[PDB]
């Protein structure tokens, strides 16, 4: 892989604009906060962005129409941490790591995404339920040396 030094926030909203007409169609209200607009980390741009991806596909299908996501970026100490919230129907306590199986069927794409956060950046990925929703959570270190 490539890693190379890029703005979280920059990602974040390019994502968004991937799927900002998806959001208007679905009446769906979308926000994205973050604590610190210069957040950089130093990581693979083209994998992270395919987990912000498949993060925010699953909220819009998880939300659906009237919905709500919220995207919130932290500046931690040593890392940076991305949360993405739906509102909708709880994960069910049973499922919370059943969910990230390659053959987790209703998928997700989460044995990828945690493939990509955990095993090639040395983050961590998950989930809980919180506000009448789900959040998917996920760290990276900010340098691979700080991992």
Same mark, same amino acid.
């Given at each position: ?9 920059? !990602? &974040?909203?390019? @994502?968004?604009?991937?799927? %900002? ?6 009446? +769906?209200?979308?926000?994205? $906060? ?17 987990? !912000? &991806?498949?993060? @925010?596909?699953?909220?819009? %299908? ?6 709500? +996501?919220?995207?919130?970026? $932290? ?73």
């Amino acid at each position: 892989m490539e890693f190379t030094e890029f703005n979280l926030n920059e !990602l &974040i909203r390019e @994502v968004y604009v991937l799927f %900002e007409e998806k959001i208007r169609k679905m009446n +769906i209200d979308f926000c994205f $906060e973050t604590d610190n607009e210069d957040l950089r980390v130093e990581a693979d741009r083209t994998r992270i962005k395919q987990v !912000l &991806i498949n993060l @925010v596909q699953n909220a819009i %299908e998880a939300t659906g129409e009237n919905g709500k +996501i919220k995207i919130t970026s $932290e500046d931690m100490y040593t890392k940076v941490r991305v949360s993405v919230w739906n509102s909708g129907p709880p994960i069910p306590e049973e499922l919370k790591e059943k969910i990230f199986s390659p053959f987790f069927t209703t998928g997700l794409g989460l044995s990828i995404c945690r493939k990509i956060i955990e095993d090639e950046h040395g983050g961590k990925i998950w989930t809980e339920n919180r506000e009448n929703g789900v959040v998917f959570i996920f760290e990276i270190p900010k340098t691979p040396e700080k991992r």
